[PDB]
Amino acid sequence: PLPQSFLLKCLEQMRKVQADGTALQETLCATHQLCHPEELVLLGHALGIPQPPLSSCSSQALQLMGCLRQLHSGLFLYQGLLQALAGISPELAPTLDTLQLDTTDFAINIWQQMEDLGMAPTMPAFTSAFQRRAGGVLVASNLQSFLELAYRALRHFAK
């Protein structure tokens, strides 16, 4: 159902986003020792960082149309949050910008696949330096987990 060409392309774009998020986390973890996304979790709720549902890419409710739809709305949310992060800091802005381009490229791809398949279709304010760094750790590790789960499920409706 899903072409191989579409899965190779997903694998490449996903490993790209994931390598960008990793570079961000390792920069935040050695410069300012925000190294454990687990401890910033209750901050996420306060800061307005949702964790987008992917129930249709789970084994319990696995459904192709559903999974594509949630993966796209999830990516579209993240694009917005990364824009609200405003680069985090001068030294972090390039890295954030690559992350944004590569997340956008991946969302274009999932939307075009939904179109080809007939499945047609305000941000938080991060007011302080601590808020932008905690935001970045949470968006970057959330995005990495989100992609791995949706990709394992895209592999199941293979070629």
136 in Cβ contact with 85 (< 8 Å): yes
CB distance 16 to 29 below 8 Å: no
Give the per-residue SS3 of 35-85.
CCHHHHHHHHHHHCCCCCCCHHHCCCCCCHHHHHHHHHHHHHHHHHHHHHC
Beta bridge partners of 158: 2
Q: Which of 154, 146, 131, 112 has the alpha carbon at shortest distance from 48?
A: 131
Range of the domain at 113: 1-159
* Number of domains the chain contains: 1
CATH number of residue 68's parent domain: 1.20.1250.10
Structure-solving method: X-ray
Give the residues across from 2 on adjacent strands.
Answer: 158
